[PDB]
Amino acid sequence: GEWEIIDIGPFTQNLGKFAVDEENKIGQYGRLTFNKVIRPCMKKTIYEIKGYEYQLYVRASDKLFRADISEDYKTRGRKLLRFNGPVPPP
Amino acid sequence: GEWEIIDIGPFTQNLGKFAVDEENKIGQYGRLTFNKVIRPCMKKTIYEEIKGYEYQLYVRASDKLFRADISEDYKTRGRKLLRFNGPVPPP
């Protein structure tokens, strides 16, 4: 499935917010406050198109994390696949 | 420095060979046998003129997947294995 690099405008920032909101619900890390998504952000398209996956570098509570998020083309449902950190700056 | 996705041709495969050979020198894993670098491969171009590059790789070695970050200084050709961690899940 093709890969590409996407910019870090408000669409992508909302993806980072989704990651932190979802992580906060799970409660593995405890309370994170979302700051910003930083570059690079990668998007995988799975084929029409079945859906997508986003790999993000998310700044939350003054630290950096990796989150992976999937999106279904047909239903538009989103899910936080993975979230770990802190990781060193790219 | 800007990021981009690069090919997985011989230049890139040789980066994965470098990674596995360097990792094998530390010997924290049992002996790893390089299989292939898989997509996606990312490159960051570092400016002071381009001073150098950093590469984030997904390397198949001994039928598992490893993430390896590599730097290289253009002038000296200094290639350095910054990290190697694994196994990780398929991208």
Curated annotation (Swiss-Prot), chain A:
Subunit-level organization: Heterodimer of an A chain and a B chain.
Record key words, sorted: Taste-modifying protein
Protein's name according to its UniProt entry: Monellin chain B
Biotech use: Natural monellin has not been mass marketed to the food industry, primarily due to the challenge of large-scale purification of the protein which is relatively sensitive to heat or acid treatment.
Superkingdom, taxonomy of origin: Eukaryota
Lipid biosynthesis found in the keyword field: no
SUPFAM superfamilies reported for this sequence: Cystatin/monellin
Positions marked as site (Blocking, abolishes the sweet taste): 41
Alphabetized Pfam families for the sequence: Monellin (PF09200)
Protein function: Taste-modifying protein; intensely sweet-tasting protein.
Organism name: Dioscoreophyllum cumminsii (Serendipity berry)
